[PDB]
Amino acid sequence: GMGNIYQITVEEKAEHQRTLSFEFSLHDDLFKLLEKVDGKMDMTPEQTQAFMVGLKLFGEVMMQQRKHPLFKEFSAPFRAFMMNLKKQ
Amino acid sequence: MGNIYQITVEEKAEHQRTLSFEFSLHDDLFKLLEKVDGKMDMTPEQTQAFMVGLKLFGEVMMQQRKHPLFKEFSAPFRAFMMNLKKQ
């Protein structure tokens, strides 16, 4: 769908307390998707949230880099995985 | 006992909703980003989104290894992880 722009920040809790921050666009409304799958995945809310954030982040990059040989061969099993998740 | 991180996602437009949570990885996420930096044919934002997304998703999969949603995806996902290390 429509591109939605997010800022993603990751900070180390311990040791050096290093941080990274980057802007990223997803073609789904992530917060609406999180409400929708909430309690549908047969996992805890923490797991559901991390899994969905992680999947949309790496899945979007593969959509942008479709022709990359890192991803051409994985596009089939990944799509099958996505289709099974959407049946939930 | 692994590295703890806090991830925040903030909508830039709309109601500017935010979410924040913690996760733990065995590997050093920042050292990992440094290694794959500009050595994937991707932009910096893609590399970061890719590595962060992949490690987050992989962590939940390792916690939920026998889960029906993940069981069949494990062989393909392991081959993918292995092939990434060769890149």
Instruction: Annotate B30-77 with DSSP letters as a single string.
Output: HHHHHHHTT-SSS-HHHHHHHHHHHHHHHHHHHHTTT-HHHHTTHHHH
Nearest CA in chain A to B70: A81
Q: How far is A53 from chain B (nearest CA, A)?
A: 7
Cβ neighbours of residue B2 closer than 8 Å, sequence gap 6 or more: B24, B25, B26
Residue with the two structure tokens 């997304």: B53
State both tokens at A88.
């939930």
Given CATH 3.10.20.850, say whether it is the number of domain B2-87: yes
C-alpha closest to that of A48 among B56, B44, B85? B56
Q: How far is A36 from chain B (nearest CA, A)?
A: 15
Delimit the domains of chain A by residue range.
Answer: 1-88
State both tokens at A87.
């049946």
Cited resolution, angstroms: 2.2
Answer whether A53 sits within 8 Å of B84, measured CB to CB.
Answer: no
- Strands B3-11, A19-26: pairing is unpaired
Burial degree of B14 (CB within 10 A; 0-12, 13-18, 19+): exposed
Residue with the two structure tokens 């932009």: B43
The answer to whether the beta carbons of residues B17 and A31 sit under 8 Å apart is yes
The Cα–Cα gap between A75 and A46 comes to 27
* Helices B74-86 + A75-86 axis angle, to 10: 140
The answer to whether the beta carbons of residues A10 and B51 sit under 8 Å apart is no
State both tokens at A4.
């939605």
The Cα–Cα gap between B66 and B73 comes to 11
Nearest CA in chain A to B59: A51
Residue B33 contacts A, CB cutoff 8 Å: yes
State both tokens at A77.
């099993």
Homologous superfamily of A1-88 in CATH? Protein of unknown function DUF3861 (3.10.20.850)
Residue with the two structure tokens 């979007």: A60
State both tokens at B25.
């990885």
C-alpha closest to that of A30 among B7, B73, B78, B65? B7
Nearest CA in chain B to A34: B19
DSSP string over chain A: ---EEEEEEEEESSTT--EEEEEEEESS-HHHHHHHHTTTSSS-HHHHHHHHHHHHHHHHHHHHTTTSHHHHTTHHHHHHHHHHHHT-
C-alpha closest to that of B83 among A5, A79, A78, A12? A78
State both tokens at B53.
């997304």
